[PDB]
Every structure is written in structure tokens, then in C-alpha cells.
Design an enzyme around this catalytic site. Sequence first.
Site, PDB file in Angstrom:
ATOM      1  N   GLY A   1     -23.551  17.970  30.447  1.00 39.60           N
ATOM      2  CA  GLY A   1     -22.252  18.592  30.618  1.00 39.60           C
ATOM      3  C   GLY A   1     -22.001  19.075  32.047  1.00 39.60           C
ATOM      4  O   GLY A   1     -20.866  19.335  32.425  1.00 39.60           O
TER       5      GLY A   1
ATOM      6  N   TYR B   1     -15.267  17.174  23.846  1.00 41.29           N
ATOM      7  CA  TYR B   1     -14.951  18.323  22.999  1.00 41.29           C
ATOM      8  C   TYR B   1     -13.855  17.939  22.030  1.00 41.29           C
ATOM      9  O   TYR B   1     -12.737  17.644  22.460  1.00 41.29           O
ATOM     10  CB  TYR B   1     -14.421  19.484  23.846  1.00 41.29           C
ATOM     11  CG  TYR B   1     -15.432  20.089  24.796  1.00 41.29           C
ATOM     12  CD1 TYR B   1     -15.663  19.532  26.050  1.00 41.29           C
ATOM     13  CD2 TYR B   1     -16.136  21.231  24.441  1.00 41.29           C
ATOM     14  CE1 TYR B   1     -16.586  20.097  26.925  1.00 41.29           C
ATOM     15  CE2 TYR B   1     -17.058  21.804  25.314  1.00 41.29           C
ATOM     16  CZ  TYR B   1     -17.274  21.232  26.551  1.00 41.29           C
ATOM     17  OH  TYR B   1     -18.191  21.793  27.409  1.00 41.29           O
TER      18      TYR B   1
ATOM     19  N   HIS C   1     -15.103  32.657  31.347  1.00 43.24           N
ATOM     20  CA  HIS C   1     -16.279  32.283  32.122  1.00 43.24           C
ATOM     21  C   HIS C   1     -15.890  31.586  33.419  1.00 43.24           C
ATOM     22  O   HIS C   1     -14.790  31.032  33.542  1.00 43.24           O
ATOM     23  CB  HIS C   1     -17.153  31.323  31.317  1.00 43.24           C
ATOM     24  CG  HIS C   1     -16.511  29.994  31.086  1.00 43.24           C
ATOM     25  ND1 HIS C   1     -15.464  29.817  30.203  1.00 43.24           N
ATOM     26  CD2 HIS C   1     -16.730  28.783  31.659  1.00 43.24           C
ATOM     27  CE1 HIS C   1     -15.080  28.552  30.225  1.00 43.24           C
ATOM     28  NE2 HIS C   1     -15.834  27.906  31.102  1.00 43.24           N
TER      29      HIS C   1
ATOM     30  N   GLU D   1     -17.895  28.451  35.883  1.00 41.81           N
ATOM     31  CA  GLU D   1     -18.794  27.356  35.534  1.00 41.81           C
ATOM     32  C   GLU D   1     -20.214  27.742  35.904  1.00 41.81           C
ATOM     33  O   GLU D   1     -20.420  28.620  36.732  1.00 41.81           O
ATOM     34  CB  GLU D   1     -18.406  26.083  36.292  1.00 41.81           C
ATOM     35  CG  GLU D   1     -17.008  25.597  35.992  1.00 41.81           C
ATOM     36  CD  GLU D   1     -16.845  25.348  34.528  1.00 41.81           C
ATOM     37  OE1 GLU D   1     -17.463  24.410  33.981  1.00 41.81           O
ATOM     38  OE2 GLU D   1     -16.166  26.154  33.929  1.00 41.81           O
TER      39      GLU D   1
ATOM     40  N   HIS E   1     -11.868  31.343  33.596  1.00 43.35           N
ATOM     41  CA  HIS E   1     -10.887  30.698  32.725  1.00 43.35           C
ATOM     42  C   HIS E   1     -11.258  30.877  31.252  1.00 43.35           C
ATOM     43  O   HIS E   1     -12.422  31.142  30.909  1.00 43.35           O
ATOM     44  CB  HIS E   1     -10.647  29.209  33.098  1.00 43.35           C
ATOM     45  CG  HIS E   1     -11.905  28.392  33.235  1.00 43.35           C
ATOM     46  ND1 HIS E   1     -12.700  28.423  34.365  1.00 43.35           N
ATOM     47  CD2 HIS E   1     -12.485  27.506  32.387  1.00 43.35           C
ATOM     48  CE1 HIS E   1     -13.734  27.608  34.196  1.00 43.35           C
ATOM     49  NE2 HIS E   1     -13.629  27.049  33.005  1.00 43.35           N
TER      50      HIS E   1
ATOM     51  N   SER F   1     -15.164  16.440  29.912  1.00 40.90           N
ATOM     52  CA  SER F   1     -15.336  17.264  31.100  1.00 40.90           C
ATOM     53  C   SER F   1     -16.731  17.213  31.698  1.00 40.90           C
ATOM     54  O   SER F   1     -17.708  16.829  31.039  1.00 40.90           O
ATOM     55  CB  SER F   1     -14.966  18.724  30.815  1.00 40.90           C
ATOM     56  OG  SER F   1     -16.010  19.379  30.134  1.00 40.90           O
TER      57      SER F   1
HETATM   58  N1  LIG Z   1     -21.953  25.520  25.274  1.00 41.86           N
HETATM   59  C1  LIG Z   1     -22.838  25.320  26.431  1.00 41.86           C
HETATM   60  C2  LIG Z   1     -22.334  24.249  27.443  1.00 41.86           C
HETATM   61  N2  LIG Z   1     -21.387  24.720  28.469  1.00 41.86           N
HETATM   62  C3  LIG Z   1     -20.163  25.354  28.182  1.00 41.86           C
HETATM   63  O1  LIG Z   1     -19.960  25.838  27.058  1.00 41.86           O
HETATM   64  C4  LIG Z   1     -19.025  25.379  29.172  1.00 41.86           C
HETATM   65  C5  LIG Z   1     -19.305  25.523  30.533  1.00 41.86           C
HETATM   66  C6  LIG Z   1     -18.216  25.479  31.424  1.00 41.86           C
HETATM   67  N3  LIG Z   1     -16.915  25.281  31.067  1.00 41.86           N
HETATM   68  C7  LIG Z   1     -16.624  25.209  29.734  1.00 41.86           C
HETATM   69  C8  LIG Z   1     -15.185  24.915  29.324  1.00 41.86           C
HETATM   70  C9  LIG Z   1     -14.863  24.375  28.056  1.00 41.86           C
HETATM   71  C10 LIG Z   1     -13.536  24.055  27.762  1.00 41.86           C
HETATM   72  C11 LIG Z   1     -13.054  23.494  26.414  1.00 41.86           C
HETATM   73  O2  LIG Z   1     -13.753  23.827  25.426  1.00 41.86           O
HETATM   74  O3  LIG Z   1     -12.032  22.806  26.448  1.00 41.86           O
HETATM   75  C12 LIG Z   1     -12.551  24.288  28.706  1.00 41.86           C
HETATM   76  C13 LIG Z   1     -12.941  24.814  29.940  1.00 41.86           C
HETATM   77  N4  LIG Z   1     -14.202  25.134  30.253  1.00 41.86           N
HETATM   78  C14 LIG Z   1     -17.695  25.180  28.791  1.00 41.86           C
HETATM   79 NI    NI Z   2     -15.190  25.977  32.039  1.00 38.67          NI
END
Ligand SMILES: NCCNC(=O)c1ccnc(-c2cc(C(=O)O)ccn2)c1
Ligand code: NI
EC number: 1.14.11.66
Length: 353
Positions: free
Chosen positions: A168, A175, A186, A188, A274, A286
Site C-alpha cells: 500500500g 479499497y 491521518h 500518510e 485527511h 491508491s
Molecule cells: N490499514 C493499514 C494500511 N494503511 C492505511 O490504512 C492508510 C494509510 C494512508 N492513507 C489511507 C487512506 C485511505 C483512504 C480510503 O479508504 O479511501 C483514503 C485516504 N487515505 C489509508
Molecule cells: Ni491517506
Amino acid sequence: SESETLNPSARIMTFYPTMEEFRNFSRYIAYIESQGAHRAGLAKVVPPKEWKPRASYDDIDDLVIPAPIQQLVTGQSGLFTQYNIQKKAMTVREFRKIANSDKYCTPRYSEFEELERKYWKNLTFNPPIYGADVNGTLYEKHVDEWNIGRLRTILDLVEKESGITIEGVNTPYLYFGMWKTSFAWHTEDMDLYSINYLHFGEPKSWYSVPPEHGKRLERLAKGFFPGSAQSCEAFLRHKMTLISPLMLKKYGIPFDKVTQEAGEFMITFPYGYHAGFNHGFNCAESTNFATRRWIEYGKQAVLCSCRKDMVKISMDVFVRKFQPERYKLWKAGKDNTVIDHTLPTPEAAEFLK
Ligand SMILES: NCCNC(=O)c1ccnc(-c2cc(C(=O)O)ccn2)c1
Ligand code: NI
Ligand SMILES: [Cl-]
Ligand SMILES: [Cl-]
Ligand SMILES: [Cl-]
Ligand SMILES: [Cl-]
Ligand code: NA
Ligand SMILES: [Zn+2]
């Protein structure tokens, strides 16, 4: 001044590149930064009308979602904590059947403001299932523009030099969303950039706090969740913390919102907090990426100090390669560089001359 003069309100900007502009990914990111886009923490890019990453999404009902997550949310008064309950593997077909059933389907509504109110009102009820963190891409093997599986930024230096892959982060995630599935507040991992493409389905709505105000959001969150803050130097990185826009407003935290539609890209920028939610059944793809400007963010990122298997990237190779004159000082723990969140990445130079 010059940089602090572009997008002074730090609002979310939306771009419509031509096919020609679209082709060079890193170059376009540098361009949107020359226009101040990063100041918002988030930007939308609408790809040229004649661009498509895939001919058809008809052939994926059999795709496996190995670890669907049921999202239980607890809280009140605009402050919530989300707990994940992993469910048994299921196919996309099986997921979509559930997403669309009367039980989980999007409620009726006229304007977005109304769906948004329903989201914050019903967040703790009828816990939905999120088909999150699925390893893979839906891009056709020959798409060369904005291909999330091969953006070719300097983040590639991680795998290139060490062989290390981080799922990821330097590989793509899919997703699959349903109504009321959420992503907590969070930034990144390692405060990287991210790119998010909504392949199909209902919209995904976003909130963003400008990086220049990121610390204010953290201060507020610490105050609201002091126990979590005591246990971890960066508890927001657990991605469990939901905070409503009304709470942000009530405590003076600047933020913006935007809704992403099928066919649209969202770019998040280093240290851009975000959060958001899905409107109904959809699929987004993503991964993270970097620019030279990120290196300093990477060096200074405040990381989770409490969990095993939390993401940490060795900055060593970036500092040696791109900041050799600072390497020794940095290893000696004496590098006191201060980040200016308004400055565009140096690759933008050509758009600024
Ligand atoms: N569960 C462990 C793996 N990493 C993450 O969860 C993670 C990390 C960074 N950005 C996101 C994120 C998700 C989304 C979404 O779910 O559309 C939108 C924007 N940012 C998720
Ligand atoms: Ni994110
Ligand atoms: Cl544009
Ligand atoms: Cl707490
Ligand atoms: Cl969570
Ligand atoms: Cl971390
Ligand atoms: Na995984
Ligand atoms: Zn932690």
C-alpha cells in the site's frame, strides 16, 4: 513571500490537465505545487476525457477481498474512535451484494450537505464492512499515464536500494467501499504524498487540514484523547480517530472539504491530515509517492512509538543522494532544518521562472 502568495487561503484546488500535461506524472505534481495546491493538503485532478486506465470492470466479481473489516464506531459530540473487526474473506460479488442490500445501502437525500449530516448522525449505528487494503491494481498492463503501479517517483529508491516493499505504500492497494465506511484522520506513513483514483461506483468525500495547520489539529486531538496521546507519540497514525467538521469549526481548526467522483484522482501532500467516508458501493486504488520536497518531511516525521509492524522507511539513502552536504550533520543529530509548508518542491522551478 512568493510561495506564500500562491493559494493564500490554502483551499482545495481542482485541475483539468490536457492529455499532454497528464503524461508526465512527477512533472504535473511539480506544476500543481507551483500553483499552491499543496497548501491545502489535498487536491483533485480530473484526467483528460479520453483517458481510461481500464476498458471494463465486468470481469472482477471473482476478485478476492481476503480481510474485509467491519467498522465499529464509538463516541458522541463529534468525537469518535473506530474499531476494526476483521471478517472472513469474500469475493467482490459477495461484497457488492451486501453493499447494495437494503441493510447497508445509501440512504435517500437531495443535497450533499444532507448526506453528510446523516453520516455524522448515524456513524455509530449499523456498522458497515469496508473491503480495505486489498493488494492489487485494476490498471490495464499498458496504461502509461498516472499508473498507480508504476508512477516512477523517487520513492522507488526504497525498493531499488533495499529490495523492501511495503504494501500500500510502495505497492498499490484497492479499497471496496459501501455507504458509511470511513477513513479516520491521518497523514500518510512517513508523511508521504498519496494518490487515490476512484475506479467506479459512488463518491468518496474528503476533509483536509492544511499542513501549515497540522500541528493545531494534533494539539486538539491530544486534548480530546489524552489517554491515547499518553500511550503513543503519534496516536493519530493508528487511523482510529474520527472528528466531525463541526468540532473542527468549534475549535478554530482550518479545513476544507471535497467530494471525489468516479474517474477522478485525489492527491494528498506531505503532512496533510485527511479523513472522509464513502457514499456507497465503490472501488478506489491508491499508493504513496514522493518528491524531493518530501525528504525533509520524511526525516522529521513523528512516528507511532507503540505498535509492532508500524511503517518506518530508512531516510539514509535519500539524505546521502539528495542532501550529501547535510548527511554528516544529520547523522550527528544536528540538522535543525525547519520545514516551510508553503514552499513548492524544487522540481517546480521550471514552472516558476
Ligand atoms: N490499514 C493499514 C494500511 N494503511 C492505511 O490504512 C492508510 C494509510 C494512508 N492513507 C489511507 C487512506 C485511505 C483512504 C480510503 O479508504 O479511501 C483514503 C485516504 N487515505 C489509508
Ligand atoms: Ni491517506
Ligand atoms: Cl487546470
Ligand atoms: Cl483518551
Ligand atoms: Cl480503525
Ligand atoms: Cl508510524
Ligand atoms: Na495487507
Ligand atoms: Zn502508536
